[PDB]
Amino acid sequence: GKINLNQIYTAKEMSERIGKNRNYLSQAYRNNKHEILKNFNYRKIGGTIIFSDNPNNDLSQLITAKEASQLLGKNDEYFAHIYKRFPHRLEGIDHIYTGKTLFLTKESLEVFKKK
DNA sequence: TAAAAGTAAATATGTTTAACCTGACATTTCCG
DNA sequence: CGGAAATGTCAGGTTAAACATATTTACTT
Secondary structure (H helix, E strand, C coil): CCCCHHHCEEHHHHHHHCCCCCCHHHHHHHCCCHHHHCCCEEEEECCEEEEECCCCCCHHHEEEHHHHHHHCCCCCCHHHHHHHHCHHHHCCCCEEECCCCEEEEHHHHHHHHHC
């Protein structure tokens, strides 16, 4: 449905946000630790596990920049290049850089197509 | 004048892996 | 045509996650 990019974190970020070690939620994810995981919305997208405290955030709306580039017929680094070199071209295009992975949303890819 | 020792699970640490962005540059497309 | 903007190549570097192993906690005997 909808997603608030101000409320999403990597596993490492959310781990330190809840006061645990950098690898806490990754270990919980890998070892199926439901007692920990059940408190969060999470989903591994590309090489990043996205976490949110807000259960109303539909993380399946996130698409990696490489996936978005391919959906437009472009080279794999298409959106990474716009983000890094021509960021005015992303104004009004929801996106979030999380460190290993740059993300757009399904909705903001549609807005970009129209542009 | 309880403590020590054992323990399995939880949590943390160090090291490596794979994602995929970065960065310099090349080439193609747009539009006067 | 011609310059500018858009989009492409690819090695390599930086990152979060994975992995392997150790330490700490919580608890019992």
